[PDB]
Every structure is written in C-alpha cells, then in structure tokens.
C-alpha cells in the first residue's frame, strides 16, 4: 500500500507572524482641539442659563418685596 504520514500538498498557505498594532489617527493636538472645543460650548450654554436663572431670581425677590407690607 501507500504511506499514511501527514504532510499534505506543500505550504499550508501563508501565515502571518509579525506584529500589528495600527490605526489611531484622531490624535494630533486636535484631540485637545475637540475637547477644549466642548468646553467652549459648555461655558457658552451655561452662561446663558445662569443669566436666565438670575432673571428668575430678581422676579422672585420681586414677589417677596411686593408681599412685605
């Protein structure tokens, strides 16, 4: 008969050993640019809302002071 030992048609195809750890492109300083940007949004909006809340504050004190007598 023939022999049943293993090796097949040669090569088993290619195999990739070498190291790969790629792909993060979002990082220049521009990460700072987007974060600091987010701050620049927060202070804008929050500024507005605190102004509004002061307006309400004066209005409430007006309620009280009109009550006082």
């Amino acid at each position: 008969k023939v022999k049943q030992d293993m090796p097949p048609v040669g090569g088993y195809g290619p195999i990739d050993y070498k190291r790969n750890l790629p792909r993060r492109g979002l990082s220049g300083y521009s990460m700072f640019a987007v974060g600091i940007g987010a701050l620049l949004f927060g202070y804008w909006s929050m500024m507005r809302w605190n102004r509004e809340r002061r307006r309400l504050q004066i209005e409430d004190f007006e309620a009280r002071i009109a009550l006082m007598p």
């Binding site: 002061r54 004066i58 002071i65």
Partner: protein, 80 residues
C-alpha cells in the same frame, strides 16, 4: 525660553498646563469685556425691602409710582 518651555512641556505636561490654567486664570478677569456686567447684575438683586423716604422738600428723582421712569433701569438686563 522656547527650548525650556518645550522641554518642561515634553517632560511634565500636567505641571505646565497647570501653570497655564493658573496664569490665564489670573490675567483674563482683568481684560475681558463682560466683567462689569456681573457686578451690575449682582447689585441689581435686592435682598432687602426698599424703604421710602419723605418726598416733599427734596430734589425730584426716583419717583413715587414704580412705572415713572426717573429711577434706575435694569432693562439692559431685560434684553441682553
């Protein structure tokens, strides 16, 4: 200067950025245009009942009826 700051910002970014937030936090309250607004706001909120005074024999201003305009006007806050 340039090399010194490049090197301290190469080694210890936390400390450099800390001094930046510090210093800018020191100077900027002096320059910015919005400063006075905060003061005038804070002074515009009464905590204490406005108390009338004897009117006759005085210089006319800050008039009796609350609608009569002669007094101070925070309308600038009404639209801002």
């Amino acid at each position: 200067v340039a090399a010194f700051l490049k090197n301290v910002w190469a080694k210890e970014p936390v400390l450099v950025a800390s001094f930046a937030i510090a210093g800018l936090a020191v100077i900027l309250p002096t320059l910015s245009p919005y400063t006075k607004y905060s003061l005038m706001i804070n002074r515009a909120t009464p905590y204490n009942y406005p108390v009338p005074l004897r009117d006759d024999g005085n210089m006319p201003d800050v008039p009796s009826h609350p609608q009569d305009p002669q007094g101070p006007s925070l309308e600038w806050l009404k639209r801002l």
